[PDB]
Nucleic acid binder design. Sequence first.
RNA 1: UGUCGAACGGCAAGUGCCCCGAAGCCAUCGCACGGUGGUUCUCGGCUGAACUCUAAGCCAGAAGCCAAUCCCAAGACCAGAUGCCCAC
Length: 95
Amino acid sequence: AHFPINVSVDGQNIEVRNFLGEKRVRRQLVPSSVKVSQTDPSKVKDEIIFDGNDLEQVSREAAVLHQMCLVKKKDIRKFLDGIYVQTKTNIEGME
RNA sequence: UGUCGAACGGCAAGUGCCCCGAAGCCAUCGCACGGUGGUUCUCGGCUGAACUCUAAGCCAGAAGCCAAUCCCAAGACCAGAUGCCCAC
């Protein structure tokens, strides 16, 4: 709604800065072979798209960023702070 | 005050009383120091079977416990290491 933000991913770790107003980084390790980028530049501006091969070795960490999110002593429904896991989906490709 | 003849000097008042007093001791009266790693459960959640967290496969983490730092130290009887050495 208001908070302009930034996020980051540095090779093997993930950063989360100015989350809800928290001006520090929120790290999280990712295993060897799960490569990911952003589309913050312009067209999407929001999404984090996880790719990979294994059912539960990329689902295991596409579960904690939604655990790294909650706003606790606060009404939750009236406003939606968080870059949270979106739309469990089986994306295939023929492009 | 008393007292050594008087000063000087002391002494007696179970340390006369008093001011100051180093050393030592001591004060939340002074001062220094006391911010660490795993493990798990609440739990957010993952896969889905027979669709959801779990029936098996699983991350994750506050306290918690557990060691660790810390204090003691083999009656835990240390075949730990090491220094030195007899008579008969």
